[PDB]
Design a protein around this ligand. Structure first.
Ligand SMILES: Nc1ncnc2c1ncn2[C@@H]1O[C@H](COP(=O)(O)O)[C@@H](OP(=O)(O)O)[C@H]1O
Length: 253
């Protein structure tokens, strides 16, 4: 079972808590970590946490009678670090009004499709994704929890021009983690200590975090999944959906 808000699939308890979620009061010093599912939430959260420490309430989460994500957030001392998978359309509007910091991480659509497929298989709280061939179409149509990859990324990319958004790419972090993590430290108003930065880079590698779903943690696993026929179909749909947007992704390391 899943419920919907404005046609976007969401966990039922989330939808039941929608009026509380939407009336959430943001604060100007909030830092909101925003990702489409599988674009790098676990990774970026670990990076932010290490930077804070140095060397988070899920706003839409609910599970009565336990405290909801917004109840937990309401009680958190500032500066609050929070997270969401909500699109710009569904985000509580107080975050826009308070000129909050947003840390957005994007990841290529093909690797997101693969990661989400395996996640739906291993996670009982997410629907059975069907065969790979079925899921391919499902994901392109956005019929997954938190909605379309395309709508998510386009919306957040558009907003970066008007709001305080540090817009990062998963593949850039994989390629040069020190370069990207330095940007997060600066965004968070931290004095960059090269020695602390170096520790964060080494401690947040896939290998370190995996030992302590962390599946493969690379770029380009999509090439192992997509047939050539699937790839040609995908590239055509992608061209149509992404037409006119200035965003570009890396597809391999
Ligand atoms: N330290 C790390 N470095 C690189 N990728 C990581 C990572 N920790 C988690 N990931 C990857 O990020 C994806 C999970 O994203 P989210 O946290 O948004 O659900 C998974 O991708 P794969 O399924 O491609 O391995 C996961 O393996």
């Amino acid at each position: 079972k899943l419920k919907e808000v404005e046609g976007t699939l969401l966990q039922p308890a989330t939808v039941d808590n929608w009026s509380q979620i939407q009336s959430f009061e943001a604060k100007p010093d909030d830092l909101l970590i925003c990702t489409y599912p599988k674009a790098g939430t676990t990774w970026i959260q670990e990076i932010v946490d290490m930077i804070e420490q140095n060397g988070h309430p899920f706003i839409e989460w609910a599970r009565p009678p336990q405290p909801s994500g917004v109840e937990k957030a309401k009680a958190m001392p500032s500066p609050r670090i929070l997270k969401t998978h909500l699109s710009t359309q569904l985000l509580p509007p107080s975050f826009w009004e308070n000129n909050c910091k947003f840390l957005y991480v994007a990841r290529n659509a093909k690797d997101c499709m693969v990661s989400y497929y395996h996640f739906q298989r291993m996670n009982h709280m997410l629907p059975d994704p069907g065969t790979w061939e079925e899921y391919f179409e499902t994901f392109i149509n956005g019929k997954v929890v938190w909605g379309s990859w395309f709508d998510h990324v386009k919306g957040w990319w558009e907003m970066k021009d008007r709001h305080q958004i540090l817009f990062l790419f998963y593949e850039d972090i994989k390629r040069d983690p020190k370069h990207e993590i330095r940007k997060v430290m600066q965004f968070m108003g931290k004095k960059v200590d090269e020695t602390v930065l170096d520790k964060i880079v080494q401690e947040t590698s896939f290998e370190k975090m995996k030992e302590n779903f962390m599946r493969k943690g690379t770029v380009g696993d999509w090439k192992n999944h997509f047939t050539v026929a699937q790839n040609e179909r995908f590239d055509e749909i992608y061209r149509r959906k992404m037409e006119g947007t200035s965003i570009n992704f890396s597809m391999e390391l």
